[PDB]
């Protein structure tokens, strides 16, 4: 096979496991989209706008491990940067590829469409560098293979997005062919002395600390260490809790799992157990303002073993070049049984998380009953995409059967992420039962991507929580800016179906205002195999989780804290 | 009055003539939105998402001369950058204001929500610098007045957008009060020797060049020179044509106006007249790939007097510090009558632009009949917002009564601009008859802002041209990426009306598939004073202007031209 | 004439008043330098290295108002960027012009010499943006006129440096001709309503505040407001003090001048007078960690009228678009006598700054005796260039006759600035008596530029203070890094003469030898004279010792939490 710039790119994308890429056409990328189309192992999937394109790829990367979005110069790329910064924040290897000017137009005093009106076309690459792990511009075909391979290998190694731009007049130009896929995953092994030392220091730290807790963090999947963490936890026999953003990164039917650790909104018993543990082994955590409940819940530095994806800090020593999967595997082999924290937890009799009983059939639907019927739908083959909003807290409360997944975007927190993310996740994982839980406010930012779920016949079940505005903001600091224009969300499904011809779309929009209506809507949803089903769930503005009220206050307090003295 | 950081900002915004600013709430900006709310001379207007917020402000600036958009850190700002780069490209002073972290969180090793996961919060400011004329971060209240005043004065002087970020814990902090508004508009006068010299060189250039044409450019309004250009044109008595993006920047009922100059898609006679003029006086032009019809129509460097907003290049000499309004005023006083090109044009008998007759009532609607009935609606109090797409060419063909305005975004060309731009323009110019002409493809990127037109009861008349995909791209280079998922656009209006209660919205969605149905829909539209009216106009995919086909080919040719030899 | 990119630039430089520009050749700028040589209204002056080239321009801008430096791509420009940041810090319009790659090598996958080994040639320009007021790359001739005019106007407007790069294959290419010089000096006027209101608010503020002190700041010359400050001071009749970096920006023989304000190292009576004043009118100040003596001396916000070059903050109102020269001119016309702080100062009997009597001729030379003899050299036609180090404090103690200038680089504080800065200043102001006061440590960074003073026959008198290392650092925080390799500094003159040069190098180890050396220096009209003065490491001003401790305490203060 002879390759071109564009087919080289396509082949590399297929080699890292992509079966799809996402795109929005524009004149600087059309020839490149033609070359990408030429690859018989990938589908090209079209999006409504470039933010949504970016977020669709982000969601795909959650299903498949990586993804790619293709956009046009400047007008496409700048909005897509928002999503790419999201991918950086969520440790996902999304490859952003932009069209770019004709290579003759550089340093030529040419003013070009889509650009600033100046004759300088480096600004986009410049901007990209701030929000990616690698960023390259391809101006000539000879430089294409090296630049492509560099950004792909970096994305996969770092679990971060990357940027490529390609001149619009070279995508069909010949270049070298790509070598074997195995080269792209090539990575450092753990330094063996370091691995051994980190594990041994961990044993010397816990030799006389029998109450050991394990804190599962939101970078565990990025480190491909989820399986190793179960092995470690089973050997240790300690208490295992998840940070809020790590929901589903540890099997909840495992007898060592005690629930969520999230400060004053932890599951019952957990906060106590963590306070009175002698050692906390944290596996790939992100400690931020949200995850620490407005800086009120910070791990005790005297007890913390900090095992990150590529380093361990233990017993006052930093060990770089120790991969978490390797650390956990070896530690699982060497560690003795340390059941103390878990014994402490059970002796608490703090009970299980208190959950409401089934609602009466005709009563007004409430937040707690929606959460109950959703929890009832969960299977080992289910993924729930949970938006920023009260849905964060509802999803957190659900008991997951082993195998069920939850997808959160808690580090970036872009409301509206969820709709294109669920689209892209559903493209990538069509075998799964894919459930989207999204608030009305969020939905409005990105709603149009539901039309793509319709176009592709994806059977996503969408729970749209219609509480008439931004209830999480209401619980941080209220004002007129938290009110939104209400829509007939259910009716939007018919809009996306088109001229309404039978072949034009099989989306369904339903309304649920009672428990009985919700039951019946769920039934219709599960039977709709040809398209998405949006269930518009009606509840009161302030009918939210107890957790949200408490977390919201501590967040408003951290954000507003006064400046300290600087002289 | 005692001021705070935030009320200082609000007051400056009011002083430059804003009566509105646009916003999307988020926790890093809520206190700042409260301070901005405290100003009794401005409305705070909420948007669905941050791209749309940015574009709403862009549209407002077309109505009012400047604008402001307020967004949250990182998740809001990065998408809004797309719109801000648009404002830069279209020479509009939009002030982007972002919320930002608590000022205690800098250089503190704190990981914060909405950010990349790192502990460095300068990246947004860095990115902003590439697409603005000034960009400042406010970390302390003492630095607020200077930074605010700097970015505002720069925006107004340069007719370019600017960036401010404000730490979330200082918006209510006291600071100095603002001085008089007059300080903000303070600008250089023309250098008198330069002004005199530029005008005199222009007379010596045209002394023996009697066939003088005037080419009105898309930076004429930015230079506030529209009125001066009429004075000059009337004194000269030459032929005056507009570049495509300068439609409505010169009164079309003026007897010296000959139509559009746009290469092979010029109005009849114009191309000939420009070829055989001896001098072309270009007033604030932008010569780009689109405006030159894929580089096939470049002005003759031997004939060109180049009068830009702040400089004139004439008779081989560059004169900086000569303001276009001043140049035109003085030139109008000194120039003799030079009627030659206009005499040449009339002697062409090239006739007027050929326009179709009224359609039969029941026949399938065609592109040309939509253009006809829209042209029939134009009054001196009308503005037409014309999207990138075939709507560029339809709008170009319309005969404007003096006073009527057309708004184009031809330099940036972000499809979807038009919907939030029309929202913001209609907020700013509610007295006008505001008409939006938008294609189906474009509409899908930003459709949700129609809900804000509903919320605010704005009587915008929207002509949605439903030709089942991206017809302009079809005419550049066709592929599967130009097909889109069709919607029931008309039905979307009921969605935005909400629970459909009488007080919930007065948007109307109508369908037009024949000339008669279009007439009747226009009537209903004009009678709907309480909300927007969307008229979904159905036509064939390839039923487009002749102009688009011709321009599309030359553009595809310029974009794809082969690389030249570099050694 | 027909213009080229290069000659357009040349003409613009001549229009802004340059009679010289400074250069270091390299293959990417040679054509450009030829084009600059076409214009015979300025001379092209060559420098040893690009750091020194930049600082030569910086000192020329002190003498003439603006300057230019020309360097080669990457290897020249990156080091020159330290001088350009320096110019930005010191408010000087220096135009840095770099040669750049052939315009065919952009977006071509070509690796070029002097670059990073990649194929991207935008990095220099991106770097420059961080330290300039404007920065433009010229890749085609048709774009040159607008880019050139934009950076020049910007430099003059903002009083800051700017950056241009010009592709090496386009410098001789035709372009449009430049218009009138007048266009380049077209600044906005003050907003009249704001000017009037700011003056009116100032008159309100001081209505019942008779004890009015005037604090003269280091951005007064950038504001072109020195003459206006004298008019205001003469009308007001209050006490005037200069900030350290503003030495010579106010005539010291004026009866309203009370000396230096600089915290605990102020002239006697000044610190008290400032504390007693009811209003302090600060004229273009820069309040930084050094100028506030480690943040120990900050103006009382309740008494401060802050008149910056382009704005005034007074009575809790900010007034942009008010130019200080105009503010001072108007205020001088309107203000009534406010003598109270000057009465207070006199009433104090604090005395004049105490200064040492002549030393015993044959005793070992001491720092105070060096300062006394230099002070005795000062005339109205004198400029002293004072290096970072104890020379800052010795110069600060000198009583200037009206007309005498001091050049300081206190914001940037790059040791070694003084040598090429004195070279460039002496090229721009050859009529003046130009004295360089420079320490041994500083001298060693940039010494080679004395060879250019020899080449051009500039009669710069150089007092090299040989105190065997970095005393200013000894007095902040001592360690082995303050010791340097000693040189025979006097013998360096002969090296720079070659085997063709009239530099003189002399040694002074007593007061009599210093007296004799200075006579020889004054008689040497054909080249520079370096006088190597030997003093003990710790023989420094008392002021350095006090200010040093305060700086160290500010630098090392603990993180707050
Ligand atoms: C793009 C973006 N803009 C603004 C915000 C700030 N923000 C955080 S949660 C929220 C409200 C979400 O409302 P909804 O989706 O209705 O969920 P609810 O809180 O009502 O449960 C907002 C505006 C954000 N996170 N991202
Ligand atoms: C944000 C953005 N993405 C992609 C493009 C490329 N583009 C230019 S015109 C066009 C099609 C617009 O289609 P429509 O609005 O339906 O107008 P029609 O051409 O059918 O008249 C596209 C995708 C763009 N200009 N801006
Ligand atoms: C380029 C540069 N490097 C390092 C420093 C730090 N520094 C400040 S003063 C000084 C010593 C000055 O030595 P000298 O010129 O001998 O003067 P003295 O202090 O002995 O009077 C140093 C190293 C600096 N200011 N600039
Ligand atoms: Mg909500
Ligand atoms: Mg269309
Ligand atoms: Mg020394």
Author numbering:
A (entry chain A), B (entry chain A): 1 to 567
C (entry chain B): 1 to 499, 504 to 565
Article, verbatim:
Pyruvate decarboxylase (PDC) converts pyruvate to acetaldehyde through nonoxidative decarboxylation, a reaction that typically occurs in anaerobic fermentations. PDC self-associates to form a 260 kDa dimer of dimers, with two active sites buried at each dimer interface. In addition, the monomeric unit of PDC is composed of three distinct structural regions. In this study, we used iterative computational protein design to rationally engineer the mesophilic enzyme, pyruvate decarboxylase, to exhibit enhanced thermal endurance at the growth temperature of a thermophilic organism.
A significant increase in thermal stability is observed with PDC2.03, which combines PDC1.01, PDC1.10 and the additional four substitutions. There are two molecules in the asymmetric unit in complex with TPP and magnesium. Each monomer has three domains with an open α/β topology with several ethylene glycol and sulfate molecules on the surface.
